[PDB]
Structure 1
Amino acid sequence: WGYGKHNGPEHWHKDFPIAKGERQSPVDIDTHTAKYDPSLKPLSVSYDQATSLRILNNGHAFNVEFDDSQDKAVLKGGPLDGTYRLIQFHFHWGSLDGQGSEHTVDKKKYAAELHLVHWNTKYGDFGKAVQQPDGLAYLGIFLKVGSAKPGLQKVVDVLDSIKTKGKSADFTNFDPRGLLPESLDYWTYPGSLTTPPLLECVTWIVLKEPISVSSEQVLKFRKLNFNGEGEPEELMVDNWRPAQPLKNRQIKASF
């Protein structure tokens, strides 16, 4: 699988039949159809004790991994029931500033999309959460081109080190709190992973307010390689999956 024409999203259904499931992600968020649910509690993000370990190029993105052997960085409140632990974060960007996001608002697409992945700690490990309908919690944050995001530069500088697939580098003392928008207002719906296995275990929480980043910041992303070292260079761009059918699902708003 990949994002090319011969291994693109439109071919995933052959290896991952679930790609044609009933609760697939991403979806288009129709702000007029979204239903404001008053009984929705405020989001609770506690990343003050977060501990990043490394950054890795897995061939379809770059992952910032965190230490989740303890309730260091947690996500609770909101639509969620219990504690969810931060395991890793990654992005989805385009070839141009006109595309890159997996999620869209009123059919609009952003430069990129930040996804912070959390697993329901009553399941004890990550591997077991994927086996549950409420095993994961995803924080979707949209990125627009404008002013530079200061708290994102550490990441942008290390990319040269993980240019190719398989590469990794130590990445400690990184505070994810520098990547959140001002407001925690969100939309929530039942979904899945936007990459194979495409398991339908995720509880989506897409924040309303986007974070701006500079054109030179987004450009560093696009300099990454899908390919492994010593292989023909295939730039890591357009690593996003097209919106899927909501199929009866309902998208709720906290605002």
Structure 2
Amino acid sequence: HWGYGKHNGPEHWHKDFPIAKGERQSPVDIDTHTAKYDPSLKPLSVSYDQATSLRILNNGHAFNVEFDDSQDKAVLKGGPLDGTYRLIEFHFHWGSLDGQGSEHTVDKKKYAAELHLVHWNTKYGDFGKAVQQPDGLAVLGIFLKVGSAKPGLQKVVDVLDSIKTKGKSADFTNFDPRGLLPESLDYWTYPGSLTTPPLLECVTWIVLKEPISVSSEQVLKFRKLNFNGEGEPEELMVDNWRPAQPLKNRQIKASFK
């Protein structure tokens, strides 16, 4: 199976997933000086007012907080998007040290972690159909730097003990994702892919310029999770991020100058 180790890490994925060498792969390095300001880009519209979280799960690669996507409760619209995209889950990628962890980089700068809020285009009916379309998913990427604690993240940090190993899940209701958003919604956008297998090129990436800060104690907790399942040798879940891929024939656009 794929993973982030020396023998099953990112450099080996292409063997089982040839598209890993595709023309629209993520993540990428965002060069702030060659990104183009596009004044035709509308402001992002995030409506997480009626969001319904359901469960938190350790999937052996990261931990996901899942949401009820049976209706338009938590949606993303505007920006470079067409149509309504429903939030289905969010997860993180982090490092073993504070100087690495994000997947995207800005001018080669790596952050301590990166949060992905995954949404699917409602015109496709369900998530499974949406991942097969070029405009099927919209992922909001938010960088995390170490500094002051993020109040809204604590609820997530406290439940991690309960889902230490692969396959464990816990009830996680009434969690409000608005507490994880930075103050500004300025962003960069480019067409890309999922960053984990199957690595489908079905994503419109919306990466926020402004990072949120979390404390070292909060990030420390992430590093205590396990890739392994209960009863197997312990492998700490750290460095679950894919390196930047070549931009190729793509232009990164900015919603700000």
TM-score, L = length of structure 1: 1.00
Deviation at 1:46, TM superposition (A): 0.1
* Regions of 4+ moved over 3 Å: none
Instruction: Could you tell me which runs of 5 or more consecutive residues in structure 1 were left unpaired when the two chains were aligned.
Output: none
1:215-234 maps to which residues of 2 (within 5 A)? 215-234=216-235
Q: Deviations over 1:23-66 (max 9, x none)?
A: 00000000000000010000000001000000000000000000
SS at match of 1:19: helix
Q: Deviations over 1:201-236 (max 9, x none)?
A: 000000000000000000000000000000000000
SS at match of 2:156: helix
Query: What does residue 36 of structure 1 align with?
Result: 37
SS at match of 1:76: strand
Q: Deviations over 1:50-91 (max 9, x none)?
A: 000000000000000000000000000000000000000000
Alpha-carbon distance in 1 for matches of 2:189, 2:166: 33
Alpha-carbon distance in 1 for matches of 2:192, 2:171: 32
Deviation at 1:242, TM superposition (A): 0.2
Q: CA RMSD in A?
A: 0.2
Alpha-carbon distance in 2 for matches of 1:168, 1:188: 33
Query: What does residue 19 of structure 2 align with?
Result: 18
Alpha-carbon distance in 1 for matches of 2:172, 2:78: 29
Query: What does residue 159 of structure 1 align with?
Result: 160
Counterpart check, 1:133 vs 2:134: yes
Alpha-carbon distance in 2 for matches of 1:96, 1:113: 13
Deviation at 1:248, TM superposition (A): 1.6
Alpha-carbon distance in 2 for matches of 1:198, 1:35: 26
SS at match of 1:226: coil
Deviation at 1:179, TM superposition (A): 0.1
Alpha-carbon distance in 2 for matches of 1:212, 1:131: 34
Query: What does residue 249 of structure 2 align with?
Result: 248
Alpha-carbon distance in 1 for matches of 2:249, 2:229: 41
Alpha-carbon distance in 2 for matches of 1:11, 1:216: 33
Q: Deviations over 1:186-208 (max 9, x none)?
A: 00000000000000000000000
Alpha-carbon distance in 1 for matches of 2:109, 2:49: 33
Q: Deviations over 1:118-149 (max 9, x none)?
A: 00000000000011000000000000000000
Alpha-carbon distance in 1 for matches of 2:223, 2:117: 20
Alpha-carbon distance in 2 for matches of 1:130, 1:119: 8
Alpha-carbon distance in 2 for matches of 1:206, 1:56: 24
Alpha-carbon distance in 1 for matches of 2:245, 2:127: 25
Alpha-carbon distance in 1 for matches of 2:42, 2:64: 30
Alpha-carbon distance in 2 for matches of 1:172, 1:155: 11
Alpha-carbon distance in 2 for matches of 1:77, 1:248: 24
Instruction: Could you tell me which runs of 5 or more consecutive residues in structure 2 were left unpaired when the two chains were aligned.
Output: none
Percent identity of equivalent pairs: 99
Q: Deviations over 1:91-119 (max 9, x none)?
A: 00000000000000000000000000000
Alpha-carbon distance in 2 for matches of 1:119, 1:51: 16
